[PDB]
Amino acid sequence: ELFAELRRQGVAPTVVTYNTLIDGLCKAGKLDEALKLFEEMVEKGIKPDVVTYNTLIDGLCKAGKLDEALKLFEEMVEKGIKPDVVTYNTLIDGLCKAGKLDEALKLFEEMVEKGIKPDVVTYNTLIDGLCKAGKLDEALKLFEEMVEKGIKPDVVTYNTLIDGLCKAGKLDEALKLFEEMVEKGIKPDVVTYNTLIDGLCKAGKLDEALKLFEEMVEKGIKPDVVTYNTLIDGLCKAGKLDEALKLFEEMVEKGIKPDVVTYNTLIDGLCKAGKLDEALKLFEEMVEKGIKPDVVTYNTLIDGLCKAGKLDEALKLFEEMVEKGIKPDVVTYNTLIDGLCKAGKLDEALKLFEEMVEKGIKPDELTYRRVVESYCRAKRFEEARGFL
RNA sequence: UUUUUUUUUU
């Protein structure tokens, strides 16, 4: 509202004010209103700049609308508004996270071709894409390459590689790398410790994780919500749910405020244990304390109910889910498809795939495998061949 | 004023 008022008087809105606003709308979520602000400013004769483009482009990548981001990239190049190292960083990230690492490497080549030097963020972004694509190998290569270029690895560089190494099973390497970053002027942070803690929990070394938690508290590094979500998931997975609820209480007492992941993590643990009551209790409680269940909450509950054989209840939560405006995803659909299919409700399952395709959700491997399976033991085999 | 790392669901 302050905008109209500022206009009203004699203050001509800058491009930075529109950029600030558009960023706000792109974070707050509402993308299409951001686009609308873009058109409004274009109209008023205020020229969108390279920051305007980068902002919208980022927001479109993170709304899943990649190809639209690329439309905007095209458009900015048409206008002579030259993409900069940030434009390319944004797009490289967007491509890596949409499973198009090869195209990302393309943009990486191209920016150099245009006299744009990759910076520490470019490298961090690619080392992350590389790791998450299984290519630890290439990631470390890149880590050598950036030092060759005189670009100084930062905390994010080390955090990224510590994580990749953990995820590949190489806990010992991650630890040695942690030591290396300390032996340098790089002070680890909450993320370094959170990453290491997660790595220790995943490898079944929960007490080493708790030790490390003590050490970060000692070293003056305040644990955050992620720290506690990580230890809570570790305890639930280790089968120690009492202790996890204890840590939950404890974080509330330490002034850490549980978020949606805290609640999903607990709901998962309780569902997996078969304590579907306590789980539903926490679902209602989170809504009560005003923490909006997302798609993972409902997915988690639905899978808990299907696994218990409470199909009706599960389906019901799917309905309530939609009615609350919560948009399903491929996980929701794989879960119900799976559950229906186990129940000899292959027809409905197929219908669920139909709807899935009709709302604009990609089916993914598991969906394919699953509906093929169900089509088979049915048994309509030509029906499956045509479905693929 | 915009871009990179850690935790939860099939």
Numbering used by the authors: 37 to 424
Question: What text appears in the publication on this structure?
Answer:
Containing a tandem array of 2–30 repeats, pentatricopeptide repeat (PPR) proteins constitute one of the largest protein families in land plants. Each PPR repeat aligns to a single nucleotide of the RNA target in modular patterns, making these proteins suitable for the development of exciting new biotechnologies. Within each repeat, the combinations of two amino acids, known as the PPR code at two key positions (the 5th and the 35th) confer RNA specificity. A typical RNA-bound dPPR protein adopts a right-handed superhelical spiral structure, with its target ssRNA molecule sitting in the interior cavity and interacting with corresponding PPR repeats in a modular fashion.
On the basis of previous investigation, we used dPPR scaffolds with four different codes: ND, NS, SN and TD. After numerous unsuccessful trials, we finally succeeded in crystallizing each dPPR-U8N2 in complex with its respective target ssRNA (5′-UUUUNNUUUU-3′), in space group P212121. When dPPR-U8C2 was superimposed on dPPR-U10, dPPR-U8A2 and dPPR-U8G2, the root mean square deviations were 0.73, 0.99 and 1.00 Å over 348, 367 and 374 Cα atoms, respectively. As observed in all four complex structures, four types of dPPR repeats recognize their corresponding targets by forming hydrogen bonds with the Watson–Crick faces of the nucleotides, which explains why PPR proteins bind ssRNAs instead of double stranded ones. The amide group of the Asn5 side chain donates a hydrogen bond to the O2 atom of the corresponding pyrimidine, whereas the N3 atom of purine accepts a hydrogen bond from the hydroxyl group of the corresponding amino acid. We observed that water molecules between bases and PPR repeats mediate hydrogen bonds between the polar residues and the bases in the cases of uracil and cytosine recognition. Each water molecule between the base and corresponding PPR repeat forms two hydrogen bonds: one with the N3 atom of the pyrimidine and one with the carboxyl group of Asp35 or the hydroxyl group of Ser35. The N3 atom of uracil is a hydrogen bond donor, whereas the N3 atom of cytosine is a hydrogen bond acceptor. Interactions with the phosphate group of ssRNA, which are invariant for repeats 1 through 8, are mediated by salt bridges between Lys13 of repeat 1 and the 5′ phosphate group of U3, and between Lys13 of repeat 8 and the 5′ phosphate group of U10.
